Amino acid sequence: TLKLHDLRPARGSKIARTRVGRGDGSKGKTAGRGTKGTRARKQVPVTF
RNA sequence: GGGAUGAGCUGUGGGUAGGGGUGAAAGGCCAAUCAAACUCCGUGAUAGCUGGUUCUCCCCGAAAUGCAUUUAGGUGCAGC
Ligand SMILES: [Mg+2]
Ligand SMILES: [Mg+2]
Ligand SMILES: [Mg+2]
Ligand SMILES: [Mg+2]
Ligand SMILES: [Mg+2]
Ligand SMILES: [Mg+2]
Ligand SMILES: [Mg+2]
Ligand SMILES: [Mg+2]
Ligand SMILES: [Mg+2]
Ligand SMILES: [Mg+2]
Ligand SMILES: [Mg+2]
Ligand SMILES: [Mg+2]
Ligand SMILES: [Mg+2]
Ligand SMILES: [Mg+2]
Ligand SMILES: [Mg+2]
Ligand SMILES: [Mg+2]
């Protein structure tokens, strides 16, 4: 019989979350921003 | 070293409060703080600025140019 320990999601459905800013083997110190300007600490509006 | 019977010094009690007081006037002083005191709240103010951002390996891999800009250490779009 199928039990609660025989259930598993479809392959490709659940993928892993990207945890940013956790060392140099992943997205490192600046977490993908890189800059020193506006884009390093804030959002730029779309209308601007 | 100056004044040391005077526009003197001092004690006790009181009054004036923050764009307000008080000033023989230095922006002085208002509790070791003053070109607008302190405390709590709005509040986790905002900062094109400086700093910080934490385990791993595999594959690829730039740019520092153009144009516009209250723009020139910022950003949009193109290029990569
Ligand atoms: Mg979630
Ligand atoms: Mg580091
Ligand atoms: Mg940095
Ligand atoms: Mg940038
Ligand atoms: Mg003498
Ligand atoms: Mg004497
Ligand atoms: Mg004398
Ligand atoms: Mg005043
Ligand atoms: Mg003066
Ligand atoms: Mg004082
Ligand atoms: Mg003011
Ligand atoms: Mg508010
Ligand atoms: Mg801030
Ligand atoms: Mg290579
Ligand atoms: Mg520039
Ligand atoms: Mg761009």
From Swiss-Prot:
Region ranges (Disordered): 1-40
Biased segments, Basic and acidic residues type: 1-9
Domain of life: Bacteria
Free-text function comment from the UniProt entry: Binds to the 23S rRNA.
Subunit structure: Part of the 50S ribosomal subunit.
Family in the record: Belongs to the universal ribosomal protein uL15 family.
Protein name: Large ribosomal subunit protein uL15
Originating organism: Mycobacterium tuberculosis (strain ATCC 25618 / H37Rv)
Phylogenetic placement of the source organism: Bacteria, Bacillati, Actinomycetota, Actinomycetes, Mycobacteriales
Residues shown, of full length: 2 to 49 of 146
